[PDB]
Amino acid sequence: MMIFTPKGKHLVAGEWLDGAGTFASAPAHGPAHDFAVGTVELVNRACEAAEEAFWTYGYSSRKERAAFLRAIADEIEARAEAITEIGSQETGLPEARLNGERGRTTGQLRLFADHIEKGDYLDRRVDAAMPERQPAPRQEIRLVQRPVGPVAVFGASNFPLAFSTAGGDTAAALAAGCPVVVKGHSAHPGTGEIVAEAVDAAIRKTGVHPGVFSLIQGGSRDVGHALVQHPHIKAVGFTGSLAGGRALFDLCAARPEPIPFFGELGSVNPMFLLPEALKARAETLGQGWAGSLTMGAGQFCTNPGIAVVIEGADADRFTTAAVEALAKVAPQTMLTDGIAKAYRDGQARFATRNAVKPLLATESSGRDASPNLFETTGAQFLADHALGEEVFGPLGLVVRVGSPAEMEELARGFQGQLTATIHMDAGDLETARRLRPVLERKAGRVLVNGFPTGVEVVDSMVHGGPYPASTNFGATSVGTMSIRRFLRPVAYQNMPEDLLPEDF
Amino acid sequence: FTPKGKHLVAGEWLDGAGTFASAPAHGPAHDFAVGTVELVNRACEAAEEAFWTYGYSSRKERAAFLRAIADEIEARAEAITEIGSQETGLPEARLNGERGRTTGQLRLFADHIEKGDYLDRRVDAAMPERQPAPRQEIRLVQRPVGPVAVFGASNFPLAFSTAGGDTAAALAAGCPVVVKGHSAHPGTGEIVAEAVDAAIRKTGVHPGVFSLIQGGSRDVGHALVQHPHIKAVGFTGSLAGGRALFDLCAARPEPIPFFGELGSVNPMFLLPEALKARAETLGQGWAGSLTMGAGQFCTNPGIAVVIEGADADRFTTAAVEALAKVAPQTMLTDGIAKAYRDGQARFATRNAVKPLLATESSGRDASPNLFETTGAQFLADHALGEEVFGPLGLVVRVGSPAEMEELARGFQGQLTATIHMDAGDLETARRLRPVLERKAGRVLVNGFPTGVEVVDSMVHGGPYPASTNFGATSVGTMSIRRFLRPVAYQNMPEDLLPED
Secondary structure, three states: OOOOOOOOOEEEOOEEEOOOOEEEOOOOOOOOOEEEOOOHHHHHHHHHHHHHHHHHHOOOOHHHHHHHHHHHHHHHHHOHHHHHHHHHHHHOOOHHHHHHHHHHHHHHHHHHHHHHHHOHHHOOEEEOOEOOOOOOOEOOEEEEEEEOOOEEEEOOOOOOOOOOOOOHHHHHHHHHOOOEEEEOOOOOHHHHHHHHHHHHHHHHHHOOOHHHEEEEOOOOHHHHHHHHHOOOOOEEEEEOOHHHHHHHHHHHHHOOOOOOEEEEOOOOOOEEEOHHHHHHHHHHHHHHHHHHHHHHHHOOOOOOOEEEEEOOHHHHHHHHHHHHHHHOOOOEEOOOHHHHHHHHHHHHHHHOOOOOEEEEOOOOOOOEEOOEEEEEEHHHHHHOHHHHOOOOOOEEEEEEEOOHHHHHHHHHHOOOEEEEEEEOOHHHHHHHHHHHHHHHHHEEEEEEOOOOOOOOOOOOOOOOOOOOOEOOOOOOOOOHHHHHHHEEEEEEEOOOOOOOOOOO | OOOOOOEEEOOEEEOOOOEEEOOOOOOOOOEEEOOOHHHHHHHHHHHHHHHHHHOOOOHHHHHHHHHHHHHHHHHOHHHHHHHHHHHHOOOHHHHHHHHHHHHHHHHHHHHHHHHOHHHOOEEEOOEOOOOOOOEOOEEEEEEEOOOEEEEOOOOOOOOOOOOOHHHHHHHHHOOOEEEEOOOOOHHHHHHHHHHHHHHHHHHOOOHHHEEEEOOOOHHHHHHHHHOOOOOEEEEEOOHHHHHHHHHHHHHOOOOOOEEEEOOOOOOEEEOHHHHHHHHHHHHHHHHHHHHHHHHOOOOOOOEEEEEOOHHHHHHHHHHHHHHOOOOOEEOOOHHHHHHHHHHHHHHHOOOOOEEEEOOOOOOOEEOOEEEEEEHHHHHHOHHHHOOOOOOEEEEEEEOOHHHHHHHHHHOOOEEEEEEEOOHHHHHHHHHHHHHHHHHEEEEEEOOOOOOOOOOOOOOOOOOOOOEOOOOOOOOOHHHHHHHEEEEEEEOOOHHHOOOO
C-alpha cells in the first residue's frame, strides 16, 4: 500500500551504501524500516568527496547554483505524497503539518535561489588604484565573499523537513557554494532518505558534482564527532540540545584547526504581559498562549514556556483563560519515546516543587503528551534557577511579579533566548520602553503582540540568540542573512581582470 | 612628555600592584602600574555600566567621539613620536606615518557609521491579507555586542594598539573597550589613553566607554577574556598566546568570539616569465619588503617560491646583494631580538637549507638573512614553514609548475599569498589562484604583502593558523562586523523601536 519503501542506505556522493549493520526506525504508526548504521569510514568517504566537489561547486556561478536549488525544490515537490506518508509515520506529526512544512522547505530553497541571483550577499567592494598617492602608491583592491568549504549539517528532530536534510542550513550552505554532509537524525531516517532522493535527482539533472551532498544515517556518538573533527569540514550547522550542541562546539574549538560551530540550542522564550494589555485582552491573550504552547505537541524551539505578569485580577483572568483553553487539548504524539519520557520527567520536577502551584496537571502516557500549567511568584523564581528550565513539550509557567520594577528584575536575570515577547497596549509604552533594551540583549528576536512560535523565512529574520540559546555569536540560522555563516571574504590586490574569480 | 605611569579605569588614573620599568631603545625608562585581576574587574564592570548609554548612542554621537579621539591624538603628535620612537626603537618617520594611519582609520570608521549601510537594516512589510495567518512586519538591524577586550600589538604601537583598528571598530559599533596594553610600549599607550580621556571629557560620553590596563601577568589577560561582561575579543600577537586565549574563550560558561591575528609567512610565487624578465628588480623589491621595520610586519614575505634555473639564480643573487647592503635595525624588545636570533639558527643549523646571507645579529638589533632550500626538503620539515619574526627570507626552489602548485596546496592558512607574473604566466596564475585564495585572506599580484591599506575592501586575516577570525577582517570597514549582532524586531510599534 506504501507509496514509498526506503532503500535504508546512506547516500555518499551519488552512491547508495550500506553501513555497519542496521537499525530499525521507531515510527509512531506505519511499519518500522531497517537503516544502515553510519561509521567513521563512511564520514571520511563523504568528507573527501565534499572536498573534491568543492573545486568545481565552490567555483560555480550563482545562476548555476540558483538552478540547482530550484531543481532540489522541484524534486522535493515531486515527492509530496511519499514525504507526508513517511514523515507523519516517523514523527507522529499530523499529515497537515508535513504538508505545510514541505511548502516552507521548498519556498526557503527558492528564496535562497532568488537571493544569490541578486548578488548583493557577495559584498562586492572595490577601492581604486592610486598610483599618484604619496609617499607610496595605492594598488587596486577588491573584496568578495567566497564559500568556506564543505559544511556539516546536523538536522533537527522537531522540524524534519525545514530544519533537516534540505532545510535551512543545507539550503544556505549550498547557496553559498558549500557542499554539505548531513548527519541524519535517528528519529526520522526515512524522511531524511526521501529528501536525499530528491537532492540526488537534482544533482543528476543539473550535472553538479555528486560530492556536493551526502547523507549519513544513524551515527553512534563517535560518528557525529568524526564529522565535526574532519579536516575538510569548514563549519557546522546544528539544531538540537544544549548538552549535545555544547559538546560538539567544544570539539570544534579543540581541533588542530578550529572551525566555527553554529548551533541552535534551547530557549524558554519568555513573554511579558503588561498591565494595560492584560486588563483589556486577558482572555484572548490566555487562549493565544494556550495555542502557542500546544502547537506540534509543544515541540517548537520558539515555544513560550513562561508568561510574566503583574499579580492581580487581570492576571487571574489571563491564567483562567489559559487553563480553560488548555483543558480542551487532547494528547499529542511526540517525536520519540525518550522525548515523551523527558517531558514526564520535566512535569515531575514542577509537580514536586513546593515553590510552584499546579494550575493544570494531566497524566501523559507513552509517546503522548497532554498540556500542563504551573504558577509561581517572581521571588520564588528568582530564588530557584531550575524554575526557568526549558521543558521540551506543552508545559507553561506563569510567574506573578509585584511591579514593573520586579518584572525588569526578572528580565535582567534571564540567560540568552531565541526570543522574548512583550504584550502591550498603548498605555503600556513606558514599561515596554524599560524592557526593550534589556530584551534586545537577551534575544535574537523581540516580538510585540504576537506569539514566538511562527518563524518567518524572510530577509529580516534573526533566528538565534545569545548563548545558551545558540553558539551563533550573532549569526541567524533562518532568513537570507544565514548565508554569512558559510562565506569568508577575500581581498584581491592589483589583480588583472582575466585572473579575477568569476564572482566579480 | 613625562608619563604618570597609571592605568586609566573609567575616567580615573589608578595605581597597580607596584610598578614595572619600560625598556626603551633610547631615552629614559619610566615606571608604570602593574595590572591586576581586580583592576580588570573594575574596568569590565564600568564598561558594562557604560554600555547602557554608549551602546544606545546615535551614530552621529559616536562619529563625533571618533573624530574627537583623532583630533586629540593629532594634538599630541610630538609627544607620541618622542615616547614612541624611544620605546620601540622605530624611526621617528615611522611613528609619524603610523599616527596618520591611526587618525585616518578613526576617521574612516566615523565616516562609515554615518553612511549607516553597516547596520544592515532590512524590512519585510506586514501582510495582513495573508492567510492562513497574516504576516507581521519584521525589521532587522545590527547592534553592538557589548564590552570588548582589545589586546594591543607589539609591532604597530599606534595603529594596532590603544586606539588602533580593533578599538576603533569596537567604539564605532557602540561597544565600550577595555585595552590590555602591551608591556613593550606603555608610555605610547599612556599618551594615546590621555587623548581618548580628553575626547571622553570633551564629548560627554560615559567614562566607562574606555579603560587601559598596563602590564600585569598572564593571569590579567586571562581574567579579561573570561570576564562575564566581556562579549568579544580583538587580539594581535603570537600563535601560542592567541590560541591559548581562544581556548579560554571557548571554555567559558558563556563562550564569546575571539578574533586573533596570529602570524604567517606570506609566501610569494614568482612565475617563470616574470622571473625571466625582472629577476633583479624582483629580488630587490623582496629585499626592501623583507627588511622594512626591522622585518616586524605580520605580513612580512618570508618565503619566495621559484622554479629552479638560471632566472631563479639571478633573482637569488639580486636579493642577496640588496640584503647585504641593509644595516642592522633595532627591534621592538630584547625578547623579540633573541627570538629572531633563534629563528636564524633554526635555518643555519639545518643541513637541508643552504645559507646565502647568514650574518649574526647582536643585542637588540636584527641583521637580514637569506637561506635556500628545495620543495621536497621544505615539505619534509614543518619548522622551515614556520614564521620568523624579523628580516629573514627563504627561497624555495621547485622543479615545475605542477610542483609549485602542489607546494601551494601544502601551505597552512596565511594572511596573504602573492603571485609575481607577466602576461605569459597567466595560464599558470589561473591554476594557482583557486588554491591560494583558499589559503589566504588577501591574494596579491605583482606587489609585496607588507603594506595593508585601511579601505572598505581590505581583508586582513586568513584561515587558521593565520587568524581565528573565521572570515572576519581585522582591518578595513568590514571589521566592524566582529562587534555587531543582528536583532529582529517583530510587529513593533514605531514608538518602541530602537533609534537606528
